[PDB]
Amino acid sequence: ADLEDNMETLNDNLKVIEKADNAAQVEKALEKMLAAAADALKATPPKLEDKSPDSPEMRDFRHGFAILMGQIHDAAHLANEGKVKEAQAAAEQLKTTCNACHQKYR
């Protein structure tokens, strides 16, 4: 999928996690975020279209996804342990990573 569609998936899944009824639901929503983040890594965002594929900016963009995937991954483990409230808090905390990339590159 393209960057916009993956971003939509990330957004929608945050809301799913916020309203989730149990740990199993939070876990699979986080797994879907992890996939969307991985699939997004390959993208060239509009703001960087004229930069080299290997520019510092493009490499920084890709790093943001590495970080996001790690954080989603850790949160998924909290849900796997049945810690629903903790997983939900960790999902909310992800927004701070979302924000950092957007302020730079969106």
Which segments are annotated as binding site for heme b? 7, 102
Shortest distance, CB of residue 38 to a second copy, whole angstroms?
Answer: 4
Q: Residue 61: which of 73, 50, 74, 48 has the closest Cα?
A: 48
Q: Which of residues 22-41 bind a second copy (CB under 8 A)?
A: 28, 31, 34-35, 38-39, 41
Give the residue, chosen from 19, 59, 63, 106, that forms a contact with Ca ion under the rule CB under 5 A: 19
Going residue by residue from 20 to 59, which x/- string records binding to Ca ion, judged by CB under 5 A? Answer: -x--------------------------------------
What is the CB neighbour count within 10 angstroms for residue 90? 21
Asked if 38 and 65 touch (Cβ cutoff 8 Å), the reply is yes
- Which one of 3-11, 23-31, 51-59, 75-83 is the stretch in contact with ligand HEM (CB under 6 A)? 3-11
Distances (CA, A) of 49 to 22, 53, 76: 41, 9, 33
Q: Which of residues 51-70 bind a second copy (CB under 8 A)?
A: 54, 59, 62, 65-66, 69-70
Helix-then-strand count for the chain, H and E: 5, 0
